[PDB]
Amino acid sequence: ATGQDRVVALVDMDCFFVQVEQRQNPHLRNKPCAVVQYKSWKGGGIIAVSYEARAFGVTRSMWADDAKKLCPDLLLAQVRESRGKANLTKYREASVEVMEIMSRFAVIERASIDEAYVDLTSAVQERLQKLQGQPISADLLPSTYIEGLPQGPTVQKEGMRKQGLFQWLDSLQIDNLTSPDLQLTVGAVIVEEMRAAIERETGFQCSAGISHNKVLAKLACGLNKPNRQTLVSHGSVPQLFSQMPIRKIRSLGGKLGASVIEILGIEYMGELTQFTESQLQSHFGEKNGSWLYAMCRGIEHDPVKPRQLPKTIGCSKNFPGKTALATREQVQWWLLQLAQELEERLTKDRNDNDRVATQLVVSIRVQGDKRLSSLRRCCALTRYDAHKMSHDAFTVIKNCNTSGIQTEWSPPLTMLFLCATKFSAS
DNA sequence: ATATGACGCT
DNA sequence: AGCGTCAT
Ligand SMILES: Cc1cn([C@H]2C[C@H](O)[C@@H](COP(=O)(O)NP(=O)(O)OP(=O)(O)O)O2)c(=O)[nH]c1=O
Ligand SMILES: [Mg+2]
């Protein structure tokens, strides 16, 4: 394998929600502006920021009323609200558009709402003998950088770009249809044309990674951004990882990586390499001394599971602070309220994808519990009717109340998560 | 007081 | 089945 079988990409839309609202209300174009959920408490919570607005310091998970103190001429599109919660239809609609476009090129896996990994390996082959040995001109990759290039014997940003591109193509071996670096270059032209096509047909710009496995392609994606792609070649990796902080590797963002530093005593992805696959396992998993040991050597094998369609549909809403729920009548209302948008989507799912969910998950968080899901009770799901799901998901949870008046509810709930899983082909 | 989906482990 | 972890 040597971390060079597949050709894998990760496309990712640049401030996805913001572009969607930027394409709708065009005054928002080329202006610093963010998108917000809810309006009462301090102007709303941010979730997405145009890059002209990150220039002032505006981050997500920040109060719109605070980021207005960071940015003065910062515009504000609010996410459509329905039944007192977030109605993200707009963006899922935009999402299905871009994935229809991408799917035309290679088998893709829907990563997030705005991300898709692509398995270009099967495609790069069906082109290398379908062009004889074409020189592969620079004009075909007008948005690609080559991480780790150019080497060296008054440049601006695009000056430096051309340079590394021509260094790539110069040592290119358009003859060796086997060389791994050459196929990288092929998948990249494809991603150039994929990326060029999405803009052509949605107006949405995005950024890509092109490399040999899921992980490199993601880290590659975020390097040059926005409206750019990076081709982290197998040879880039020792330079790229030498100073890459370990937490920037997908899967290493959470606890595992946190302890990886605290146990091994390091900070960068390169520092992780001075250990045996045996040695690492004793400090971590039997699967994690392994996975790490290949990763820090630029090798990963988790395949692009081709799947453009989520396995689960779910509606969630938080009740933070003094807005937690403490009434039998209050919990019941929202569970219906949640069940009402859930029906809507499930029917949208039925007549779109020809499938139907079978089990319902009801989940709640509690004021106090150091947990997202303090409870998660998985039940049955026949007909797509809210009142049925409403009452049934309630009767699931009614027996963890500890108020001795049954009109009230305690400890109050911070979250209701209604989630439909197990879609059968009917 | 920063709405969602994927998966792993038991 | 039901928790815990990771992610956008
Ligand atoms: C991380 C995150 C994202 N989102 C929404 C908003 C994003 O616009 C959209 C994709 O999130 P992203 O890919 O992490 N960031 P972005 O697409 O807005 O900006 P960029 O990719 O860094 O250019 O999903 C949430 O609603 N809650 C969250 O916690
Ligand atoms: Mg994005």
mmCIF file of all heavy atoms in Angstrom, chain A residues 12-18 37 47-49 51 54 60-61 88 112-115 225-226, chain B residues 3, chain C residues 8, ligand 1:
data_model
loop_
_atom_site.group_PDB
_atom_site.id
_atom_site.type_symbol
_atom_site.label_atom_id
_atom_site.label_comp_id
_atom_site.label_asym_id
_atom_site.label_seq_id
_atom_site.Cartn_x
_atom_site.Cartn_y
_atom_site.Cartn_z
ATOM 1 N N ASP A 12 -15.126 20.973 0.033
ATOM 2 C CA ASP A 12 -15.687 21.613 1.210
ATOM 3 C C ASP A 12 -16.059 23.021 0.797
ATOM 4 O O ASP A 12 -15.207 23.752 0.291
ATOM 5 C CB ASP A 12 -14.678 21.612 2.366
ATOM 6 C CG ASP A 12 -14.984 22.659 3.438
ATOM 7 O OD1 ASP A 12 -14.680 23.857 3.225
ATOM 8 O OD2 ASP A 12 -15.516 22.281 4.504
ATOM 9 N N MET A 13 -17.322 23.392 0.990
ATOM 10 C CA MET A 13 -17.778 24.705 0.558
ATOM 11 C C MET A 13 -17.322 25.784 1.536
ATOM 12 O O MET A 13 -17.387 25.610 2.759
ATOM 13 C CB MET A 13 -19.296 24.716 0.419
ATOM 14 C CG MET A 13 -19.855 23.469 -0.232
ATOM 15 S SD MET A 13 -19.241 23.105 -1.890
ATOM 16 C CE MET A 13 -19.794 24.512 -2.840
ATOM 17 N N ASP A 14 -16.858 26.906 0.989
ATOM 18 C CA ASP A 14 -16.347 27.992 1.812
ATOM 19 C C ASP A 14 -17.514 28.774 2.401
ATOM 20 O O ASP A 14 -18.381 29.239 1.653
ATOM 21 C CB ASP A 14 -15.446 28.910 0.981
ATOM 22 C CG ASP A 14 -14.341 28.147 0.237
ATOM 23 O OD1 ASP A 14 -13.641 27.305 0.857
ATOM 24 O OD2 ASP A 14 -14.175 28.397 -0.978
ATOM 25 N N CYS A 15 -17.496 28.956 3.732
ATOM 26 C CA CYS A 15 -18.616 29.458 4.539
ATOM 27 C C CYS A 15 -19.960 29.126 3.902
ATOM 28 O O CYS A 15 -20.617 29.998 3.328
ATOM 29 C CB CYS A 15 -18.513 30.973 4.803
ATOM 30 S SG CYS A 15 -17.320 31.956 3.851
ATOM 31 N N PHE A 16 -20.372 27.863 4.008
ATOM 32 C CA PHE A 16 -21.459 27.351 3.176
ATOM 33 C C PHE A 16 -22.746 28.137 3.368
ATOM 34 O O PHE A 16 -23.304 28.664 2.402
ATOM 35 C CB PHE A 16 -21.701 25.866 3.439
ATOM 36 C CG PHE A 16 -22.765 25.276 2.553
ATOM 37 C CD1 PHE A 16 -22.713 25.465 1.189
ATOM 38 C CD2 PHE A 16 -23.822 24.555 3.085
ATOM 39 C CE1 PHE A 16 -23.689 24.938 0.360
ATOM 40 C CE2 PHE A 16 -24.807 24.021 2.262
ATOM 41 C CZ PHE A 16 -24.737 24.214 0.892
ATOM 42 N N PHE A 17 -23.233 28.232 4.611
ATOM 43 C CA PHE A 17 -24.487 28.945 4.840
ATOM 44 C C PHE A 17 -24.407 30.364 4.311
ATOM 45 O O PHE A 17 -25.315 30.823 3.607
ATOM 46 C CB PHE A 17 -24.855 28.946 6.325
ATOM 47 C CG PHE A 17 -25.265 27.582 6.847
ATOM 48 C CD1 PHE A 17 -25.175 26.456 6.044
ATOM 49 C CD2 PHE A 17 -25.749 27.430 8.135
ATOM 50 C CE1 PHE A 17 -25.550 25.225 6.521
ATOM 51 C CE2 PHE A 17 -26.120 26.187 8.615
ATOM 52 C CZ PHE A 17 -26.021 25.093 7.811
ATOM 53 N N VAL A 18 -23.289 31.047 4.587
ATOM 54 C CA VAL A 18 -23.123 32.446 4.187
ATOM 55 C C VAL A 18 -23.222 32.593 2.672
ATOM 56 O O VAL A 18 -23.906 33.489 2.169
ATOM 57 C CB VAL A 18 -21.794 33.003 4.734
ATOM 58 C CG1 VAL A 18 -21.331 34.203 3.925
ATOM 59 C CG2 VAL A 18 -21.948 33.379 6.209
ATOM 60 N N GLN A 37 -28.523 31.893 14.262
ATOM 61 C CA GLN A 37 -29.652 31.121 14.778
ATOM 62 C C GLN A 37 -30.284 31.858 15.961
ATOM 63 O O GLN A 37 -29.582 32.238 16.906
ATOM 64 C CB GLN A 37 -29.198 29.723 15.212
ATOM 65 C CG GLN A 37 -29.532 28.596 14.211
ATOM 66 C CD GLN A 37 -28.530 27.439 14.244
ATOM 67 O OE1 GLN A 37 -27.857 27.210 15.254
ATOM 68 N NE2 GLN A 37 -28.424 26.712 13.130
ATOM 69 N N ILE A 47 -23.052 30.994 13.372
ATOM 70 C CA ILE A 47 -22.687 29.641 12.950
ATOM 71 C C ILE A 47 -21.844 29.677 11.682
ATOM 72 O O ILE A 47 -21.275 28.650 11.291
ATOM 73 C CB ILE A 47 -23.924 28.749 12.709
ATOM 74 C CG1 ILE A 47 -24.931 29.476 11.816
ATOM 75 C CG2 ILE A 47 -24.534 28.250 14.016
ATOM 76 C CD1 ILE A 47 -26.250 28.786 11.730
ATOM 77 N N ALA A 48 -21.784 30.829 11.004
ATOM 78 C CA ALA A 48 -21.075 30.888 9.728
ATOM 79 C C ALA A 48 -20.726 32.328 9.390
ATOM 80 O O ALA A 48 -21.568 33.219 9.532
ATOM 81 C CB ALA A 48 -21.901 30.272 8.595
ATOM 82 N N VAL A 49 -19.498 32.538 8.902
ATOM 83 C CA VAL A 49 -18.888 33.865 8.772
ATOM 84 C C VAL A 49 -18.229 34.003 7.400
ATOM 85 O O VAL A 49 -17.316 33.237 7.065
ATOM 86 C CB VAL A 49 -17.844 34.119 9.879
ATOM 87 C CG1 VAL A 49 -17.338 35.532 9.827
ATOM 88 C CG2 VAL A 49 -18.411 33.795 11.256
ATOM 89 N N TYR A 51 -15.603 35.466 4.793
ATOM 90 C CA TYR A 51 -14.184 35.716 5.059
ATOM 91 C C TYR A 51 -13.870 37.209 5.189
ATOM 92 O O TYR A 51 -12.955 37.587 5.925
ATOM 93 C CB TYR A 51 -13.318 35.095 3.965
ATOM 94 C CG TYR A 51 -13.137 33.603 4.068
ATOM 95 C CD1 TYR A 51 -14.063 32.726 3.513
ATOM 96 C CD2 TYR A 51 -12.015 33.067 4.691
ATOM 97 C CE1 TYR A 51 -13.885 31.341 3.588
ATOM 98 C CE2 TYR A 51 -11.820 31.688 4.784
ATOM 99 C CZ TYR A 51 -12.756 30.824 4.233
ATOM 100 O OH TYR A 51 -12.549 29.457 4.338
ATOM 101 N N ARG A 54 -14.366 37.432 8.942
ATOM 102 C CA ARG A 54 -13.294 36.870 9.755
ATOM 103 C C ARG A 54 -12.081 37.802 9.808
ATOM 104 O O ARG A 54 -11.232 37.660 10.695
ATOM 105 C CB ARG A 54 -12.893 35.498 9.198
ATOM 106 C CG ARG A 54 -14.044 34.649 8.643
ATOM 107 C CD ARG A 54 -13.536 33.237 8.322
ATOM 108 N NE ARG A 54 -14.556 32.366 7.746
ATOM 109 C CZ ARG A 54 -14.346 31.114 7.348
ATOM 110 N NH1 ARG A 54 -13.157 30.539 7.451
ATOM 111 N NH2 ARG A 54 -15.353 30.425 6.817
ATOM 112 N N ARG A 60 -17.606 31.686 14.725
ATOM 113 C CA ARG A 60 -18.843 31.012 15.082
ATOM 114 C C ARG A 60 -18.908 30.807 16.595
ATOM 115 O O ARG A 60 -17.950 31.069 17.332
ATOM 116 C CB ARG A 60 -18.968 29.681 14.350
ATOM 117 C CG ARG A 60 -17.718 28.832 14.408
ATOM 118 C CD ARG A 60 -18.041 27.355 14.173
ATOM 119 N NE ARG A 60 -19.262 26.988 14.882
ATOM 120 C CZ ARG A 60 -19.312 26.614 16.152
ATOM 121 N NH1 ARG A 60 -18.211 26.479 16.881
ATOM 122 N NH2 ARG A 60 -20.500 26.389 16.713
ATOM 123 N N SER A 61 -20.066 30.337 17.054
ATOM 124 C CA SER A 61 -20.309 30.113 18.476
ATOM 125 C C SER A 61 -19.958 31.365 19.265
ATOM 126 O O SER A 61 -19.251 31.334 20.275
ATOM 127 C CB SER A 61 -19.544 28.890 18.985
ATOM 128 O OG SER A 61 -20.242 27.690 18.674
ATOM 129 N N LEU A 88 -33.385 24.638 8.603
ATOM 130 C CA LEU A 88 -32.232 24.633 7.721
ATOM 131 C C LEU A 88 -32.552 24.019 6.364
ATOM 132 O O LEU A 88 -31.649 23.525 5.681
ATOM 133 C CB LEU A 88 -31.072 23.901 8.407
ATOM 134 C CG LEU A 88 -30.591 24.454 9.767
ATOM 135 C CD1 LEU A 88 -29.875 23.424 10.625
ATOM 136 C CD2 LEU A 88 -29.697 25.672 9.597
ATOM 137 N N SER A 112 -20.018 16.116 5.781
ATOM 138 C CA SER A 112 -20.948 16.913 6.559
ATOM 139 C C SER A 112 -22.011 17.469 5.620
ATOM 140 O O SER A 112 -22.166 16.982 4.490
ATOM 141 C CB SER A 112 -20.209 18.017 7.318
ATOM 142 O OG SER A 112 -19.838 19.087 6.462
ATOM 143 N N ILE A 113 -22.742 18.500 6.073
ATOM 144 C CA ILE A 113 -23.703 19.135 5.172
ATOM 145 C C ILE A 113 -22.989 19.813 4.014
ATOM 146 O O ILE A 113 -23.552 19.922 2.919
ATOM 147 C CB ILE A 113 -24.624 20.134 5.907
ATOM 148 C CG1 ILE A 113 -25.851 20.411 5.059
ATOM 149 C CG2 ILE A 113 -23.944 21.477 6.170
ATOM 150 C CD1 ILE A 113 -26.735 21.449 5.624
ATOM 151 N N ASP A 114 -21.744 20.263 4.214
ATOM 152 C CA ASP A 114 -21.029 20.968 3.160
ATOM 153 C C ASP A 114 -19.733 20.283 2.731
ATOM 154 O O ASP A 114 -18.928 20.900 2.023
ATOM 155 C CB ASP A 114 -20.755 22.413 3.592
ATOM 156 C CG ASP A 114 -19.533 22.542 4.484
ATOM 157 O OD1 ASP A 114 -19.329 21.670 5.374
ATOM 158 O OD2 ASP A 114 -18.784 23.530 4.282
ATOM 159 N N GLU A 115 -19.519 19.025 3.103
ATOM 160 C CA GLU A 115 -18.292 18.321 2.761
ATOM 161 C C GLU A 115 -18.591 16.977 2.112
ATOM 162 O O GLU A 115 -19.505 16.261 2.534
ATOM 163 C CB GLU A 115 -17.427 18.100 3.999
ATOM 164 C CG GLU A 115 -16.693 19.322 4.453
ATOM 165 C CD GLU A 115 -15.964 19.080 5.745
ATOM 166 O OE1 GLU A 115 -15.990 17.926 6.210
ATOM 167 O OE2 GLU A 115 -15.377 20.035 6.299
ATOM 168 N N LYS A 225 -7.067 28.271 0.843
ATOM 169 C CA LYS A 225 -8.475 28.456 1.125
ATOM 170 C C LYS A 225 -8.675 29.958 1.252
ATOM 171 O O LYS A 225 -7.928 30.607 1.994
ATOM 172 C CB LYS A 225 -8.857 27.707 2.411
ATOM 173 C CG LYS A 225 -10.329 27.340 2.562
ATOM 174 C CD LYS A 225 -10.497 26.062 3.388
ATOM 175 C CE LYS A 225 -11.897 25.952 4.000
ATOM 176 N NZ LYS A 225 -12.980 25.831 2.974
ATOM 177 N N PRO A 226 -9.652 30.555 0.561
ATOM 178 C CA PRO A 226 -10.741 29.953 -0.204
ATOM 179 C C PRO A 226 -10.496 29.885 -1.704
ATOM 180 O O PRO A 226 -9.490 30.350 -2.217
ATOM 181 C CB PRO A 226 -11.906 30.892 0.124
ATOM 182 C CG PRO A 226 -11.251 32.258 0.213
ATOM 183 C CD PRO A 226 -9.800 32.019 0.619
ATOM 184 P P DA B 3 -30.600 24.397 18.874
ATOM 185 O OP1 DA B 3 -31.469 25.304 19.666
ATOM 186 O OP2 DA B 3 -30.130 23.118 19.453
ATOM 187 O "O5'" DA B 3 -31.315 24.059 17.473
ATOM 188 C "C5'" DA B 3 -30.811 24.639 16.260
ATOM 189 C "C4'" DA B 3 -30.276 23.580 15.296
ATOM 190 O "O4'" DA B 3 -28.908 23.268 15.604
ATOM 191 C "C3'" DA B 3 -31.034 22.232 15.269
ATOM 192 O "O3'" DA B 3 -31.619 22.021 13.941
ATOM 193 C "C2'" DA B 3 -29.956 21.181 15.628
ATOM 194 C "C1'" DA B 3 -28.678 21.916 15.265
ATOM 195 N N9 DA B 3 -27.486 21.451 15.977
ATOM 196 C C8 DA B 3 -27.316 21.358 17.331
ATOM 197 N N7 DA B 3 -26.124 20.937 17.688
ATOM 198 C C5 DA B 3 -25.465 20.742 16.485
ATOM 199 C C6 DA B 3 -24.162 20.299 16.178
ATOM 200 N N6 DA B 3 -23.259 19.956 17.108
ATOM 201 N N1 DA B 3 -23.819 20.221 14.874
ATOM 202 C C2 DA B 3 -24.724 20.563 13.950
ATOM 203 N N3 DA B 3 -25.973 20.990 14.116
ATOM 204 C C4 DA B 3 -26.286 21.057 15.420
ATOM 205 P P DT C 8 -14.444 19.050 11.433
ATOM 206 O OP1 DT C 8 -13.311 19.274 10.506
ATOM 207 O OP2 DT C 8 -14.419 19.652 12.794
ATOM 208 O "O5'" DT C 8 -15.811 19.489 10.694
ATOM 209 C "C5'" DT C 8 -16.390 18.627 9.689
ATOM 210 C "C4'" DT C 8 -17.759 19.122 9.270
ATOM 211 O "O4'" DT C 8 -18.747 18.840 10.307
ATOM 212 C "C3'" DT C 8 -17.841 20.611 8.993
ATOM 213 O "O3'" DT C 8 -18.666 20.858 7.844
ATOM 214 C "C2'" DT C 8 -18.448 21.173 10.279
ATOM 215 C "C1'" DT C 8 -19.344 20.043 10.760
ATOM 216 N N1 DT C 8 -19.479 20.015 12.279
ATOM 217 C C2 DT C 8 -20.734 20.057 12.864
ATOM 218 O O2 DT C 8 -21.769 20.089 12.230
ATOM 219 N N3 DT C 8 -20.730 20.054 14.233
ATOM 220 C C4 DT C 8 -19.622 20.020 15.069
ATOM 221 O O4 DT C 8 -19.714 20.023 16.296
ATOM 222 C C5 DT C 8 -18.346 19.984 14.398
ATOM 223 C C7 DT C 8 -17.077 19.942 15.199
ATOM 224 C C6 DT C 8 -18.338 20.000 13.053
HETATM 225 C C1 LIG D 1 -19.098 23.458 13.077
HETATM 226 C C2 LIG D 1 -20.575 23.828 12.906
HETATM 227 C C3 LIG D 1 -21.127 24.152 11.543
HETATM 228 N N1 LIG D 1 -22.539 24.507 11.374
HETATM 229 C C4 LIG D 1 -23.105 24.841 9.976
HETATM 230 C C5 LIG D 1 -22.740 25.987 9.594
HETATM 231 C C6 LIG D 1 -21.641 25.771 8.407
HETATM 232 O O1 LIG D 1 -21.703 26.890 7.452
HETATM 233 C C7 LIG D 1 -21.913 24.661 7.828
HETATM 234 C C8 LIG D 1 -20.531 23.954 7.511
HETATM 235 O O2 LIG D 1 -19.699 24.168 8.650
HETATM 236 P P1 LIG D 1 -18.041 24.235 8.401
HETATM 237 O O3 LIG D 1 -17.706 23.379 7.181
HETATM 238 O O4 LIG D 1 -17.292 23.806 9.656
HETATM 239 N N2 LIG D 1 -17.549 25.877 8.197
HETATM 240 P P2 LIG D 1 -17.977 26.844 6.841
HETATM 241 O O5 LIG D 1 -18.400 26.012 5.649
HETATM 242 O O6 LIG D 1 -19.078 27.804 7.260
HETATM 243 O O7 LIG D 1 -16.619 27.750 6.498
HETATM 244 P P3 LIG D 1 -15.237 27.145 5.794
HETATM 245 O O8 LIG D 1 -15.475 25.738 5.240
HETATM 246 O O9 LIG D 1 -14.130 27.131 6.832
HETATM 247 O O10 LIG D 1 -14.905 28.105 4.661
HETATM 248 O O11 LIG D 1 -22.656 23.827 8.875
HETATM 249 C C9 LIG D 1 -23.435 24.544 12.572
HETATM 250 O O12 LIG D 1 -24.586 24.822 12.446
HETATM 251 N N3 LIG D 1 -22.884 24.218 13.929
HETATM 252 C C10 LIG D 1 -21.474 23.860 14.100
HETATM 253 O O13 LIG D 1 -21.032 23.594 15.182
#
